[PDB]
Design a protein around this ligand. Structure first.
Ligand code: HEA
Ligand code: HEA
Ligand SMILES: CCCCCCCCCCCCCCCC(=O)OC[C@H](COP(=O)(O)OCCN)OC(=O)CCCCCCCCCCCCCCC
Ligand SMILES: CCCCCCCCCCCCCCCC(=O)OC[C@H](COP(=O)(O)OCCN)OC(=O)CCCCCCCCCCCCCCC
Ligand SMILES: CCCCCCCCCCCCCCCC(=O)OC[C@H](COP(=O)(O)OCCN)OC(=O)CCCCCCCCCCCCCCC
Ligand SMILES: CCCCCCCCCCCCCCCC(=O)OC[C@H](COP(=O)(O)OCCN)OC(=O)CCCCCCCCCCCCCCC
Ligand code: CUA
Ligand SMILES: [Ca+2]
Ligand SMILES: [Mg+2]
Ligand SMILES: [Zn+2]
Lengths: 121, 238, 88, 69, 268, 537, 57, 100, 69, 45
């Protein structure tokens, strides 16, 4: 776990993600005989974080200009959807949020500010 | 009895089941014309007046059915029961069997129809049988009807009820006559039992419906009623 | 953490594997050998052959239908044709 | 309107290249059959043997039943 | 930033793959060859063989490439393998509903026999030539039941991280399946009636053929799986094929027990 | 060298976008051949007697059978069921690609050899003669001698197994690749419908596979499966065939239901009335459309109790469909309507034709009533006025509604509207007189007819001619749209509300749509949905 | 003996498509493609003979 | 169900009592004109005051245009304009029919 | 009882279907109560129990079927 | 690779003067196939 977390932190290129390999005469285990994106997924899930973002947003904290609801965005365009007040407030409409601009809800008035956890290029 | 030109109704016929079928059809048409014209008018009026140039504001905030969906469930279902019941008692009247009198056989192999009346087997030992054939176009009698005549025409007496036997020994055929409203499938191997009753004394027309190869359209069926003395003379003639 | 759960799962799997080995080498074998012995008895009882019967209502009018020639050989032979159990 | 008239005209133009019609499509035979099935009470209720019967019955009329050439 | 070099979705990306188009082409070849051989046209022997070898080559290469991609690139994420399992389950449900057709065919042909059959579903004169309930097929059924028990034992031992026990169980299962196939061939040779003999023989033969081909598919799956196990390409959690084969074999055994209940008890 | 790139982008490509276009093109090239076949068969029956032919009845049987089979299995199913689903379902579910790309690529290419072999079979000395529903004794080696109908059987088999293989990946894709926060209940109606059709088709078609194979084996292995002397009962064949045929038309028409329920709101700017009730009624229809199959065997001669059981339940199908039509009628009123839009025109014209066709279908669902119309032109009128008015209209509306998303071009509104009007008038005057022709008591599938029927056939022929001009205009408009370089914005069907400023709307309102597909650029990217869209949980 | 890691690292270094990543795969497809082309050429004549009623003798 | 007829009237008057953003004003004004509820005198007057506050002219004339469109007959519109004329003359509002 | 056995062996199919359903239900109820036992594994164990019971009742029925006096 | 589609997926290049004849000829032959089909069945007659 902690050693695996250190291994995850210590990496340079995707070519370096490898498995040590099992021992002949016995069935190996995924902790030593994994390769490719499956290895990345398992290390990410054991490290405690998420490989990709799969967190559905919350309908509370109605949007305000000073404090907009934050949305994880690996991309400058991060399409989302708004229900507004806690589930059942209004129909679900889709929105797109550009780079660091605010998208306000046309029924509730909720702004979703955007960030970017990655270099643009 | 026979097709006309530019026809709109079905035809004028004579059969106890045919009148009931026409009555049921009239009631069912009376039922459906209502709904058809209603839906047509609703579709026309909900659009002809609510175009964008006249209704720029849309009441987008009504998407709940309080008491309307229930009536949608009930009223057409009420109409469904109202139409189902008469058809049900008509069918439960038709499924019974009256007192048998005599039978005919309608075996037909391919592009011709054979009829048998073997009820009257007696010391003469001469059962009556023949084959009805498509009359050629050239040899049609002056004033005849093309595609609807046969040479050896079938003969059944009037006001006498016959428990017709339907059978085939080849690809499946059908035995249809719109005036009498009686039909069944000439399914090989198995015999189909159907009844019949003619009220008038007239020539009736019909043909098969289920395709049986290249000449599926070359076996017309003609059955005409006869009086008792004419029937007896016809029977003693052969 | 992972050690306790993996040990428990492996222990349960090993116990089930031992139980299933006992199942496959305790009851399945006797049933198989008993069935084999009974099958051999039935097979050896009826070694009288006499599988050539004719003239006792032959054919029955729905045997060996020939509407399209059989592809194998001349056209009157089947893939599993036998000279003792298949006749005409 | 133009599409409808083009379709009608084209169908009419490609119509004449068909096989000759059966010999029974003549006014004479149509009227002979009309007077024929009346005798055998074929549909006398409100059809081919009605009491008055000003209507046609078994005549299509128009081009379908032309005069004998 | 390691995630920057990576994508944002755990689903695999494939390209090229000329296998589907040429597989369609070779299937068309096989269909044309079979249609020609049905009517006994000349030069119809080598055509069918060549088409079948082409089909064998194409789907064998497809399977090899798919297994390779599932091995090196490691696209066998949890969602992907879950979806694969649901797809396999959907396929076996489709197989059940396919077999239901022949089941209803036998039921209709049996419950209401024609009037030339002597008012009995067992044909007159052939009824005494039917298959007795207690003979070699019963031995084959008990062999299949013991084979399933041994396969379950091997699977549980493999769960217990055991090579020898699971491998021996798989070897016993393969040998038992091979002897079952030999016994089925022997029963086929000693068939009292041909498929063309009445509807009883036709329905029996149609019912047995589908089970035979499904069991052949199971045997090829088992030998392939033991090939991967020997090649050292299977791990504890990278074992979707093992569970798929186990579920399929239990499904086919249930279908076989239903067939044994109906055809060899009700019809005899 | 772009040739390698050409064939890798088209043949050795497994992207969903690059395949649905080929689905549409294959559907089009099948539909043209089918329409010409229909035109020739309708021109044959313009007047009584042999006409343009030497009385060749077998040729007419080949023509009708080919038209039916190719237009029911090569025009509508492959170009509607999976053509607009594989392209669009990943967009609405929140996934970048289908579950199994390789099977998606494989399913498409099983169809071209099917078309070639079907054409070869029809080009034999005799050709198929059993019609769309071929029957064993007629198909028996006694009637046909040659490789004519065996290839048709094989084509049906392989097309069915391909369609089943083309529907296994879709269900997994829309059951496991759902967006984070997208409950299955909250799924859009179109994908709901398409999943229902997928499950119904996969559940039913195997039965056809087995039955068709066992029936075909009669010609080669001389099996007694259906021989009258061999103990076989053809009523079993009819039951097997109509356990499939009855739900096939529903699974073909449900995509039309979904596309209409999608076209109405966006061009009406009003949410769909009663989504949950509509989808639950459609689920009731889907479950209901299986236990009723013997309405096609009303005059065969089955027992009274079975006839009553399977005729009473025929009526209950109407209630959910009437509820759906009433819901759409309620949705239309109140909200704004842009009646001049071509998709709106097709959606509006769909409803009246579908409801009159449904009334005709409920006419002949009684054993007491079917005896006067079984295997006559009335059933032809019913099933044609339902099929070509619902499925064809839905396909045309879907094309005219999602074409910018497929390619990124604009069509000509004037020519499209003219084509719609011409086609509507032609198809209304084509199947109109056939109602009277079947009401008189005259059967179907007859190249010759008694003389007292000429007028209605003459009235039908002109409309049949008109439909060909409609097809020509559609071809011209498709070509013009393809080579007009008319640009299209991100969401062409989004307009400012009654209180949106011309400067506020342009800068603080763009990029909003009722569905996901309108959020992306009209020519969609190869790799969309890099991150999963997350809604309110 | 467990060479799967070594061969994995050896084969991940190439950018070829997965159906040509393993060396020696190309030699099993080119004659395969030639045989498929020959099969198509023969089947063309076979179908042409089938449609045109005749048999060689 | 949810809000009744008059409750939404009072709620929207309270909301329009304090609006400082053009976008929010337009949003609430759109959402008000969908309940078949013609605004009362206080509601329209407060909407006009809000439009004056957020410094947007065309919204004011759009109010009267939309009210004229929504109202069923000419008599109700004439009564509304008669009872609201002073306001429009106080805030310098020019009607559409007199604008051009 | 000399009469209960007659009905017990008269209708083998209905009673065998009933006992199969009883075994299926009982095995599902008993097996689906543990932690280290997924649903497919418990279903497989239940089906194995059903197969064994079916085999033993088949042998018993074919043994008792000889009493056809 | 991050290319931007030019909103052109026609499966084959299209332009005014030359390709029109090819498109129309393909349409005509695929329209007129049924003709040769109906002629084939009445060749030896
Ligand atoms: C294309 C799709 C489609 C659809 C949607 C339908 C819809 C229906 N069809 Fe039809 N049908 C076919 C396709 C279709 N059919 C085909 C292809 C055939 C011929 C098969 C062949 O021979 O190959 C056929 C044939 C066919 C027959 C065979 C007749 C014969 O040949 O002997 C029957 C008989 O019951 C039937 C019944 C119905 C019924 C009850 C409906 C119902 O779904 C209709 C329900 C709809 C409504 C009724 C309208 C809306 C309802 C309301 C407004 C509620 C209020 C209404 C009332 C109270 C009146 N169909
Ligand atoms: C898929 C369903 C379908 C469709 C669409 C059609 C379309 C048509 N059918 Fe057919 N038909 C059947 C299904 C269908 N049919 C079936 C099952 C049978 C029975 C077969 C049997 O008996 O064996 C049959 C049989 C049949 C007969 C039987 C012959 C006889 O009994 O005498 C006749 C004759 O009138 C006929 C006519 C027509 C006509 C005129 C059209 C159309 O011309 C009506 C108008 C439609 C168009 C002209 C096409 C429009 C197309 C487009 C504009 C292109 C769009 C393309 C895309 C964008 C991809 N059909
Ligand atoms: C490509 C897929 C083809 C196989 C499909 C399998 C489907 C299983 C269900 C179908 C039942 C099959 C039973 C027949 C087995 C048998 O051997 O039939 C029995 C006969 C001989 O037996 P006998 O009379 O000696 O028995 C009595 C013993 N004394 O042999 C045959 O006729 C050989 C041909 C049978 C077909 C199997 C091989 C197929 C090759 C051609 C492919 C045809 C493709 C058709 C179009 C796609
Ligand atoms: C006539 C009628 C014919 C009908 C034919 C039906 C065939 C469809 C049967 C569906 C089974 C699909 C396999 C499981 C799906 C799956 O799960 O695929 C996902 C798994 C991944 O699992 P993994 O990550 O653990 O291993 C990753 C390995 N790299 O792939 C597998 O490794 C399959 C495991 C065994 C397969 C080896 C090859 C066996 C070939 C059998 C067929 C041979 C040809 C037979 C004749 C065509
Ligand atoms: C209709 C009834 C007939 C029987 C049904 C079976 C049809 C043929 C078998 C097709 C596989 C079914 C799905 C398996 C699960 C699956 O999905 O396997 C997985 C793959 C696709 O998924 P993937 O690799 O992208 O997954 C991603 C992995 N993570 O499958 C295949 O590559 C299929 C292999 C190609 C075979 C196609 C040719 C079919 C021949 C048909 C003729 C033989 C039968 C003749 C019958 C008379
Ligand atoms: C076969 C034909 C037989 C017909 C028999 C049916 C008779 C009953 C049907 C009438 C019930 C609905 C009326 C509304 C009553 C009401 O006032 O409902 C209340 C709501 C008022 O709005 P609200 O909810 O926001 O109020 C909020 C309260 N605070 O109305 C509506 O929203 C109507 C919106 C949908 C209705 C549109 C109707 C479209 C056509 C319907 C069917 C047409 C039939 C055509 C054939 C005749
Ligand atoms: Cu006789 Cu059809
Ligand atoms: Ca004609
Ligand atoms: Mg019929
Ligand atoms: Zn909101």
């Amino acid at each position: 776990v902690k050693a695996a977390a250190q291994e995850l932190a210590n990496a340079k290129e995707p070519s370096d993600l490898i498995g040590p390999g099992g021992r002949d005469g016995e069935v190996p285990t995924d902790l030593e005989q994994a390769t490719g994106l499956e290895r990345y997924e398992l290390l990410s899930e054991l490290s405690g974080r998420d490989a990709f973002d799969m967190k559905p947003l919350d309908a509370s904290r109605k949007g305000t200009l000073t404090d907009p609801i934050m949305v994880t965005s690996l991309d400058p365009y991060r399409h989302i959807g708004c229900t507004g007040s806690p589930s059942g407030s209004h129909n679900l409409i889709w929105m797109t949020v550009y780079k660091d601009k605010l998208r306000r809800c046309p029924e509730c008035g909720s702004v979703y500010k955007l960030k970017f956890m990655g270099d643009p290029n | 009895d026979a097709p006309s030109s530019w026809a709109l109704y079905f035809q004028d016929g004579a059969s106890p089941s045919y009148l009931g079928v026409t009555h049921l059809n009239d009631y069912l048409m009376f039922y459906l014309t209502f709904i058809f014209i209603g839906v047509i008018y609703a579709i026309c009026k909900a659009v002809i007046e609510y175009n964008y140039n006249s209704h720029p504001i849309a009441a987008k905030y009504t998407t709940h059915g309080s008491i309307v969906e229930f009536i949608w469930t009930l009223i057409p279902a009420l109409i469904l029961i109202l139409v189902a019941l008469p058809s049900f008692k008509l069918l439960y009247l038709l499924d019974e069997v009256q007192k048998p009198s005599m039978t005919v056989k309608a075996i037909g192999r391919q592009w011709f129809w054979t009829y048998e009346l073997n009820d009257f087997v007696t010391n003469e030992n001469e059962p009556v049988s023949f084959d009805s054939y498509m009359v050629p176009e050239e040899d049609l009698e002056e004033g005849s009807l093309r595609q609807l005549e046969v040479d050896n025409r079938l003969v059944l007496p009037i006001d006498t009820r016959i428990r017709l036997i339907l059978t085939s020994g080849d690809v499946i055929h059908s035995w249809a006559v719109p005036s009498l409203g009686i039909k069944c499938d000439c399914i090989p191997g198995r015999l189909n039992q159907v009844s019949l009753s003619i009220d008038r004394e007239g020539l009736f027309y019909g043909q098969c419906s289920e395709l049986c190869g290249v000449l599926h359209s070359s076996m017309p069926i003609v059955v005409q009623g006869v009086s008792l003395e004419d029937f007896l003379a016809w029977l003693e003639e052969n | 953490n992972w050690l306790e759960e993996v040990q428990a799962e492996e222990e349960h799997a090993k116990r089930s594997s031992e139980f299933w080995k006992k199942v496959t080498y305790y009851i399945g074998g006797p049933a198989l050998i008993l069935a084999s012995a009974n099958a051999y008895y039935i097979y050896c009882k009826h070694q009288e052959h006499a599988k050539h019967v004719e003239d006792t209502d032959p054919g029955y009018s729905f045997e060996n239908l020939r509407f399209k020639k059989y592809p194998w050989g001349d056209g009157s032979k089947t893939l599993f044709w036998n000279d003792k159990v298949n006749h005409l | 309107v133009a599409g409808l008239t083009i379709g009608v005209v084209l169908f009419g133009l490609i119509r004449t290249q068909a096989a000759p019609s059966p010999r029974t499509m003549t006014r004479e035979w149509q009227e002979k059959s009309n007077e024929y099935m009346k005798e055998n009470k074929i549909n006398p209720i409100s059809g081919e043997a009605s009491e008055g019967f000003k209507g046609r019955g078994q005549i299509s009329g128009g081009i379908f039943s032309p005069s004998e050439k | 930033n390691l995630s920057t070099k990576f994508q944002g979705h755990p689903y695999h990306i494939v390209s090229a793959s000329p296998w589907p188009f040429f597989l369609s082409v070779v299937l068309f070849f096989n269909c044309l060859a079979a249609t020609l051989y049905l009517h006994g046209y000349k030069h119809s022997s080598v055509f069918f063989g060549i088409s079948f070898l082409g089909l064998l080559a194409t789907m064998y290469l497809w399977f090899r490439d798919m297994s390779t991609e599932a091995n090196i690139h490691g696209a066998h994420t949890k969602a992907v393998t879950k979806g694969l399992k649901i797809g396999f389950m959907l396929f076996l449900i489709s197989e059940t509903f396919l077999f239901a057709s022949i089941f209803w065919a036998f039921f209709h042909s049996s419950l209401s026999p024609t009037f030339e059959l002597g008012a009995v579903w067992p044909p007159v004169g052939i009824a005494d030539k039917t298959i007795d309930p207690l003979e070699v097929p019963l031995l084959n059924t008990v062999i299949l039941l013991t084979s399933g028990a041994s396969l379950t034992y091997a699977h549980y031992s493999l769960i217990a991280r055991n090579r020898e026990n699971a491998l021996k169980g798989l070897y016993m299962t393969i040998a038992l399946s091979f002897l079952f196939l030999g016994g089925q061939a022997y029963e086929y040779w000693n068939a009292p009636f041909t498929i063309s003999d009445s509807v009883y023989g036709a329905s029996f033969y149609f019912a047995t053929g589908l089970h035979g081909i499904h069991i052949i598919v199971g045997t090829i799956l088992l030998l392939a799986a033991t090939y991967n196990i020997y090649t050292y390409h299977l791990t504890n959690t990278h074992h979707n094929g093992f569970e798929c084969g186990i579920y399929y074999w239990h499904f086919c055994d249930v279908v076989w027990l239903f067939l044994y209940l109906t055809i060899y008890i009700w019809g005899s | 060298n772009s040739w390698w790139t050409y064939v890798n982008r088209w043949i050795f490509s497994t992207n969903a976008k690059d395949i649905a276009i080929l689905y549409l093109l294959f559907g089009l090239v099948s539909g043209i051949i089918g329409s010409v076949f229909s035109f020739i068969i309708r021109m044959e029956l313009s007047a009584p007697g042999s006409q343009f032919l030497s009385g060749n009845g077998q040729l007419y049987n080949v023509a009708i059978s080919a038209h039916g089979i190719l237009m029911i299995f090569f025009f509508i199913i492959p170009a509607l069921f999976g053509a607009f689903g594989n392209y669009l379902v990943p967009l609405m579910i929140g996934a970048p690609d289908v579950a199994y790309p390789r099977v998606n690529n494989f399913t498409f290419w099983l169809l071209p050899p099917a078309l070639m072999l079907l054409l070869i079979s029809a080009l034999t000395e005799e050709g198929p003669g059993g019609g769309w529903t071929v029957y064993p004794p007629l198909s028996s080696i006694t009637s046909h001698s040659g490789p004519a109908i065996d290839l048709a059987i094989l084509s049906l088999q392989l097309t069915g197994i391909s369609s089943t293989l083309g529907s296994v990946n879709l269900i997994a894709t829309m059951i496991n690749m759902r967006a984070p926060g997208l409950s299955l209940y909250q799924m859009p109606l179109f994908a709901w419908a398409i999943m229902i059709t997928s499950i119904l088709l996969l559940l039913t078609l195997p039965v056809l596979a087995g039955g068709l194979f066992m029936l075909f084996s009669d010609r080669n292995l001389n099996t007694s499966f259906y021989a009258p002397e061999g103990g076989g009962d053809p009523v079993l064949y009819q039951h097997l065939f109509w356990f499939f045929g009855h739900p096939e038309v529903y699974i073909l028409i449900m995509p039309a239901f979904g596309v209409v329920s999608h076209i109405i709101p966006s061009l009406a700017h009003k949410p769909i009335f009663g989504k949950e009730g509509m989808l639950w009624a459609m689920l009731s229809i889907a479950l209901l459309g299986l236990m009723v199959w013997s309405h096609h065997l009303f005059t065969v001669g089955l027992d009274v109790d079975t006839r009553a059981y399977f005729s009473a339940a025929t009526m209950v199908i109407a209630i959910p469909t009437g509820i759906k039509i009433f819901s759409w009628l309620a949705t239309l009123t109140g909200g704004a309507i842009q009646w001049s839009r071509v998709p709106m025109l097709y959606a509006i014209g769909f409803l009246i034709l579908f409801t009159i066709g449904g009334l005709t279908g409920v006419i002949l669902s009684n054993s007491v009533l079917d005896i006067a119309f079984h295997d006559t032109y009335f059933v032809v009128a019913h099933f044609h006025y339902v099929l070509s008015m619902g499925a064809l209209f839905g396909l045309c509306g879907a094309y005219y509604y999602w074409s910018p998303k497929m390619f990124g071009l604009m069509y000509n509104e004037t020519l499209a509207s003219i084509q719609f009007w011409i086609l509507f008038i032609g198809v209304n005057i084509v199947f109109g007189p056939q109602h009277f022709l079947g009401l008189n008591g005259m059967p179907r599938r007859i190249p010759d007819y008694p003389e007292a029927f000429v007028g209605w056939n003459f009235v039908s022929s002109i409309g049949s001619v008109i439909s060909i001009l409609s097809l020509f205009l559609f071809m011209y408009v498709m070509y013009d749209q393809f080579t007009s370089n008319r640009v299209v914005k991100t969401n062409p069907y989004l307009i400012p509300s009654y209180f949106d400023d011309n400067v506020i709307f342009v800068n603080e309102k763009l990029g909003v749509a009722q569905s996901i597909e309108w959020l992306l650029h009209s020519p969609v990217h190869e790799h969309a949905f890099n991150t999963l869209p997350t809604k309110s949980i | 003996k467990n060479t799967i890691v070594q061969q994995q690292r050896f084969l991940q270094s190439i950018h070829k498509p997965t159906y040509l990543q393993r060396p020696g795969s190309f030699a099993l497809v080119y004659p395969y493609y030639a045989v498929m082309a020959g099969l198509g050429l023969y089947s063309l004549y076979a179908s042409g003979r089938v449609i045109f009623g005749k048999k060689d003798a | 169900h949810g809000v009744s007829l008059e409750e939404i009237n009072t709620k929207y008057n309270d909301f329009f009592s304090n609006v400082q953003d053009q976008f929010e004003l337009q949003r609430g004004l759109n959402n008000c004109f969908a309940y078949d509820i013609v605004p009362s005198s206080d509601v329209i007057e407060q909407a006009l005051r809000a439009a004056r506050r957020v410094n947007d002219f065309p919204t004011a004339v759009r109010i009267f245009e939309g009210i004229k469109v929504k109202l069923p007959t000419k008599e109700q519109y004439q009564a509304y304009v008669k009872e609201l004329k002073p306001v429009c003359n106080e805030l310098g509002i020019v009607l559409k029919e007199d604008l051009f | 009882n000399q009469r209960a056995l007659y009905y017990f062996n008269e209708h083998k199919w209905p009673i065998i279907l009933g006992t199969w359903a009883s075994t299926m239900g009982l095995s599902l109820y008993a097996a689906s109560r543990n932690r280290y036992d997924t649903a497919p594994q418990k279903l497989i164990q239940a089906r194995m129990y059903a197969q064994g019971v079916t085999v033993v009742v088949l042998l018993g029925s074919v043994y008792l079927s000889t009493l056809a006096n | 690779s991050a290319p931007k589609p030019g909103s052109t997926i026609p499966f084959y290049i299209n332009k005014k003067p030359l390709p029109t004849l090819l498109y129309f000829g393909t349409f005509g032959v695929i329209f007129s196939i049924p003709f040769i089909v109906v002629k084939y069945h009445n060749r030896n007659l």
